[PDB]
Amino acid sequence: PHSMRYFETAVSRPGLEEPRYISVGYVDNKEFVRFDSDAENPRYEPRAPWMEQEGPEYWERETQKAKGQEQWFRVSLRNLLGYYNQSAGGSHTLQQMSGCDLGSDWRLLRGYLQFAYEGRDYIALNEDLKTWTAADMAAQITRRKWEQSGAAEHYKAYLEGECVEWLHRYLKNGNATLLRTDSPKAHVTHHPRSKGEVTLRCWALGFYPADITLTWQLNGEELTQDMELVETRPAGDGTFQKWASVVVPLGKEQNYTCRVYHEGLPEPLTLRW
Amino acid sequence: KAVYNFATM
Amino acid sequence: MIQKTPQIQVYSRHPPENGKPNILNCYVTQFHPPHIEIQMLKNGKKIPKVEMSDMSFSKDWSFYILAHTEFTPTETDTYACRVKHDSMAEPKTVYWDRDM
Secondary structure: OOEEEEEEEEEEOOOOOOOEEEEEEEEOOEEEEEEEOOOOOOOOEEOOHHHOOOOHHHHHHHHHHHHHHHHHHHHHHHHHHHHOOOOOOOOEEEEEEEEEEEOOOOOEEEEEEEEEEOOEEEEEEOOOOOOEEEOOHHHHHHHHHHHHHOHHHHHHHHHHOHHHHHHHHHHHHHHHHHHOOEOOEEEEEOOOOOOOEEEEEEEEEEEEOOOOEEEEEEOOOEOOOOEEEOOOEEOOOOOEEEEEEEEEEOOOHHHEEEEEEOOOOOOOEEEEO | OOOOOOOOO | OOOEOOEEEEEEOOOOOOOOOEEEEEEEEEEEOOOOEEEEEEOOEEOOOOEEOOOEEOOOOOEEEEEEEEEOOOOOOOEEEEEEOOOOOOOEEEEOOOOO
16 A cells, blocks of 8 residues: 655745745655755755665756745745735745555555645545545635646646656665564563552554554453553654553552564564563 | 646645 | 644653663644744753754644653653643643653
């Protein structure tokens, strides 16, 4: 279910500085390219090792594409103050997400093209890659301008064409890399947390991708009662972390057992305190 | 490779 | 009228061993506008060269960022993270906790 996305953001802030434009591209949810109008030398930059295989011609051109995207966002950003009759005093955000999903047959599985203004859905190209969905009065105007302009039809091209032609190409150069993983390292920590009850916290660290499941089972019957969890979070080195806890009667801690499910494992982890 | 927007909003 | 409440998580990169150098993460997520203010604190005082990750957002348009700084935990020192986003009346401070 490989995929590629390009997250674009343009934020305008109170001041003399022209708005800032940032663009981040992904391949299977992995960042591989980036562009920040704030960089000393604005240019798209490699973000994945497998991208270093591309030559200058690739970067010069994409950076020129970013430059344009920037004016586009800049101009659009301007038009929005208009549709919304907003006072030229403050800051606003305009986001875009586009890209394409690739089926098993290397065929375009689906395309995406949607924008959000102030973090809320604005305009969006429907799955038929033919029609639009505007979210409020303002977007109706954009929608029309585009239907009349014949825009949908030109994004469809990209989604069905270039987005695919390259995504596969990228996957090609970075299959080894993208395909890699880092199993989790786990262990349980004891914790006072009561005078009769104790807290067991099963830790999973250094794993990648971020997907993972952690269970707590007392002789068979997995537990869900008094079980805590935490949003999976970045360690700051590429991998991720996560833990789950369960309230357990004292002098019984060793009865409960924790298991850790991850694709990196050749077999799920099974440990206790 | 990145999309290239067409008509502005 | 252009925001959404942020989520914060303070935690070490490696399991905490007093005296042993570690790295302290402040994982702030679910906020918007992308504009946010972040301070890591040591014993109630702003830590200097605090590094921020590049800005990114999720499928729901919300942004997330990781603020981190090297630190060496000690039985007595207390660290925390403070966030001041326009989606909050007041800034939020959440203290670290070697058991979480």
